[PDB]
Write a protein that binds this ligand. Sequence first.
Ligand SMILES: NC(=O)N[C@@H](CC(=O)O)C(=O)O
Ligand SMILES: [Zn+2]
Ligand SMILES: [Zn+2]
Ligand SMILES: [Zn+2]
Ligand SMILES: [Zn+2]
Ligand SMILES: [Zn+2]
Ligand SMILES: [Zn+2]
Ligand SMILES: [Zn+2]
Ligand SMILES: [Zn+2]
Ligand SMILES: [Zn+2]
Ligand SMILES: [Zn+2]
Ligand SMILES: [Zn+2]
Length: 423
Amino acid sequence: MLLKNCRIIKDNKIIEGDILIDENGRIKKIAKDIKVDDEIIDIKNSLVIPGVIDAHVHFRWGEEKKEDFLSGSLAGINGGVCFAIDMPNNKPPITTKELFYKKLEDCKKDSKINVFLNFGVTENNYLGTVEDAKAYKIFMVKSVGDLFIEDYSKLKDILNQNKLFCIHAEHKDVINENLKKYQLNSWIDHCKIRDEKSEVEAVKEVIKNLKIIDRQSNKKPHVHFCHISTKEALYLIKKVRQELKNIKITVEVTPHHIYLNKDMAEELKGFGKFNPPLREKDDNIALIKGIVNKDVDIIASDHAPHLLEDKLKNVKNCPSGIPGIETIVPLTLNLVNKGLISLFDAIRVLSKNPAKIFNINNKIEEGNLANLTIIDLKKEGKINAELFKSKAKFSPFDGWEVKGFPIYTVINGTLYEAYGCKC
Ligand SMILES: NC(=O)N[C@@H](CC(=O)O)C(=O)O
Ligand SMILES: [Zn+2]
Ligand SMILES: [Zn+2]
Ligand SMILES: [Zn+2]
Ligand SMILES: [Zn+2]
Ligand SMILES: [Zn+2]
Ligand SMILES: [Zn+2]
Ligand SMILES: [Zn+2]
Ligand SMILES: [Zn+2]
Ligand SMILES: [Zn+2]
Ligand SMILES: [Zn+2]
Ligand SMILES: [Zn+2]
């Protein structure tokens, strides 16, 4: 297949050229006006970027009414996402080697995109190694089963390893104290119970232990904070990065924590209920500036589908989480078009940094498998949840008009239409 008339992100510039993909799905040649007898697709000077990586999704193994590997990977294709990293809070949670490989088998059967699996860390399994896991997920609050570190005194021992850890950082003791002071009556109460302090104190708890490891140990963990949502946690991470010599810290934010804030909580109802919850407008601003200042490393969706039936319940019965894999790319490109981040900022947080952090080769280079996201940067259009391929066909962004859509997704050389080729 020949992709004709591409504007390509290669190295760190925009070059015009054609991309020739051989029948093994590998990039065979990148050059201007390639003239070959082949199937030809005219890209019409759309932008071709190294395939987007969504480092934080929940495809709901064991709970397939909510999402499965097929519907989740069709949603990724629709969203322009070539790689996804799936979290281990399943039913049952992925806390043993045997469960990992049983899930991996199901993943292989039906995923249409490149999916990687994280392993779930417990107080009992944390020294174990799973060769094919991308990262080890630590929940500092209850999730499912024993996938929840209840004893924070063990964090130093858990983190003192040459491993890539992803951390859901909310502080169990702050939340328990708040549950004694507030009733869960309306949507804003979720934001007060899991308040900004509960995130900040969890981040502080991790950082205190990393300083010890950095000084007293020869292990060099990499710690990736999932969905950071507060200005104060970002500031603390920025500070401690100047103090640590051996340990690398990376930071992920979500589209909903950039765009949405707790003044919207009562209007969003269940579609605004997620963990960590809605924050202040000042936090939205801090996260955007953190992208521009390169304090924020990646954007990931925390794609967390639930049944619509349950998301329409009252705050006490409504599960936390929203789908997002089909909106992460348009919402990020929309920031470029509103002048809040640069085009290269968007490429960095969606494609280049996740590839560096998680060791994924999405590069547009001759010889590499072709995993490409093709975007129409200027296309204006409405997000319409009825056009989602996820089983979760709803979103707080439903009906929003944004600018910038993926139009094609190329998975290991196979061309698919994406959301914007129906807009
Ligand atoms: N974030 C959420 O609100 N929900 C996620 C879990 C998580 O990322 O904590 C889910 O799995 O539903
Ligand atoms: Zn071909
Ligand atoms: Zn021929
Ligand atoms: Zn299915
Ligand atoms: Zn989380
Ligand atoms: Zn690393
Ligand atoms: Zn310090
Ligand atoms: Zn705040
Ligand atoms: Zn998550
Ligand atoms: Zn239900
Ligand atoms: Zn019900
Ligand atoms: Zn307009």
